[PDB]
Design a protein around this ligand. Structure first.
Ligand code: MG
Ligand code: MG
Lengths: 404, 46, 82
């Protein structure tokens, strides 16, 4: 075969803007995403729930053959997992920030930083709406263009792809390294939701409440002018009326009522929330709306399976890139360990029920090593390797040892 | 509050800025000895 | 003291912008007297809005009497050579 790709890719042209950079989006489109995120209300909350499902349950670092890595780091033993856990102490927060950013924006992006002494400090996320990639004909990123607000207006600069790293959850194709904003992709669905919400709110103001209509004068009788109506307005004023005010009139004054004109705003709200949640890939139940019939049985099993599948796909997409483009370079450059080691980063299942896992452990624990049970139960494996590796319970081994 | 117009997303909104007028140079607090007086009238002895 | 209608305050009123935007979108000509109330012309300073019918979409949308070809409702400023 060949050592370089020989199929081409759809590439550059700046989406047919001019002075070409990025692919098919600009710093203004990026700041449009920023406003959808920061502007609050129901849309912002839903995409915040999407971040929390994908990344909010935290993470665990794995290395295959971790025990083989045992080395004195600074006159003190560590494995590669132990070194990585000390290198990335707050990884649960970083994963939620980067993962959330990579759902909102086309990418999460950031630096590696060093202490003054030149040891690793942190992986530092950058503000993704400020940065856009420049890519070559093969589709790979070569430089990053940044612009940012300052007291003196906008400041602009260009950085090499060497010392930045980036992560893309929403690829257009397996070869895409610029990605898609799900927010820009669903701009019409989001704007339709906002428009219908505004429509309902204003319709409730006009039509949800009755209004008093005083008609003055006899029909086909003497006309009443504006100054005449002002004196009548003074009598029936809702400012000064109270619940049990009573009215006395001649026959030629009529207190009519604009009734509240019924419309099913609840049904329109449910329709809007269905459209928006389906467009953003969330279940309808996330929007504080419940469908009939769908709340039970195999209809529930399917939708909650689809949600868990979508989460696993996003999680693995993130995990692979984070290990390959953040962890491995940090291990290579700042660690006494082998950077080609089989590092993994699992991200926890947000909808796992430990009560269901307990039932599983009771039913089939007889086929699981104590380490496998401890992993499923989300606890440290036993400190003693023979009992960790054995199949029967550590408590059962202890009560049998107590018989010796 | 009750705004007559709603603001839509993706900055399809109205252009919402004010351009500043001329701003005069302010220096007296730095360019002189400042006395924070206890009374609105008073005396410096020479 | 300033009121929302007072002449120095008009540029701060959201409604003055929004109604001038409407006036530009609904007009067919610079002839305001025909198309708007005296109240609207004064309240929104419509003499100073660049009203001429060039911003009204109906200036550009086709509306022929007979429509064999689905030509009606097409907007010339959305075509390839515009
Ligand atoms: Mg008469
Ligand atoms: Mg004195």
């Amino acid at each position: 075969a060949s050592s370089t790709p020989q199929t081409n890719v759809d590439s550059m042209g700046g989406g047919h803007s001019y002075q070409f950079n990025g692919q098919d989006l600009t710093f203004e489109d990026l700041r449009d995403i920023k406003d959808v995120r920061d502007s609050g209300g129901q849309v912002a909350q839903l995409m915040d729930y999407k971040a929390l499902l994908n990344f909010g349950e935290g993470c665990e670092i794995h290395v295959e053959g971790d025990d083989e890595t045992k080395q004195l780091v600074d006159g003190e033993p560590m494995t590669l997992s132990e070194w990585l856990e000390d290198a990335f102490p707050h990884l649960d927060l970083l994963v939620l920030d980067l993962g959330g950013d990579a759902l909102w924006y086309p990418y999460a992006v950031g630096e590696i930083q060093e202490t003054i002494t030149g040891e690793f400090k942190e992986a530092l996320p950058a503000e993704p709406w400020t940065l856009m990639p420049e890519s070559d004909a093969q589709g790979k990123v070569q430089a990053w263009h940044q612009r940012t607000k300052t007291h003196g207006g906008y400041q602009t600069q260009t950085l090499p792809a060497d010392d930045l790293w980036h992560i893309v959850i929403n690829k257009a194709s397996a070869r895409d390294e610029v990605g898609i904003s799900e927010v820009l992709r669903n701009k019409d669905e989001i704007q339709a939701f906002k428009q219908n919400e505004a429509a309902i709110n204003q319709a409730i103001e006009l039509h949800g409440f009755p209004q008093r209509h005083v008609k003055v004068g006899k029909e086909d009788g003497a006309p009443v002018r504006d100054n005449d109506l002002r004196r009548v307005r003074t009598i029936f004023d809702p400012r000064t009326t109270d619940a049990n005010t009573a009215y006395f009139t001649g026959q030629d004054v009529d207190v009519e009522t604009l009734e509240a004109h019924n419309f099913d705003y609840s049904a329109i709200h449910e329709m809007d929330m269905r459209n928006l949640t389906t467009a953003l890939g969330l279940p309808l139940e996330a929007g504080n709306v419940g469908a009939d019939g769908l709340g039970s049985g195999k209809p529930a099993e399917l939708r909650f399976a689809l949600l868990k599948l979508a989460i696993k796909a996003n999680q693995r997409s993130f995990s692979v890139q984070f290990v390959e483009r953040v962890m491995r370079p940090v291990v290579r450059d700042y660690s006494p360990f082998d950077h080609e080691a089989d590092i993994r980063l699992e991200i926890n299942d947000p909808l796992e029920d430990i009560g269901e896992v307990a039932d599983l452990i009771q039913q089939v624990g007889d086929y699981m090593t104590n380490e496998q049970v401890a992993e499923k139960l989300d606890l440290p494996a036993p400190e003693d390797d023979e009992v960790a590796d054995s199949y029967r319970s550590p408590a059962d081994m202890e009560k049998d040892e107590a018989g010796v | 509050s009750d705004p007559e117009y709603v603001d839509t997303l993706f900055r399809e909104q109205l252009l919402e800025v004010v351009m500043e007028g001329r701003e005069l140079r302010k220096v007296a607090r730095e360019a002189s000895n400042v006395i924070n007086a206890n009374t609105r009238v008073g005396d410096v002895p020479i | 003291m300033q009121l929302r209608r007072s002449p120095g305050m008009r540029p701060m009123d959201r409604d003055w912008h929004q109604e001038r935007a409407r006036a530009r979108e609904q007009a067919y000509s610079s002839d305001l007297t025909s198309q708007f109330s005296e109240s609207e012309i004064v309240k929104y300073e419509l003499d100073t809005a660049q009203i001429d019918g060039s911003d009204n979409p109906r200036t550009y949308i086709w509306n022929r009497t007979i429509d064999l070809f689905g030509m009606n409702g097409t907007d010339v400023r959305e075509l390839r050579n515009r």
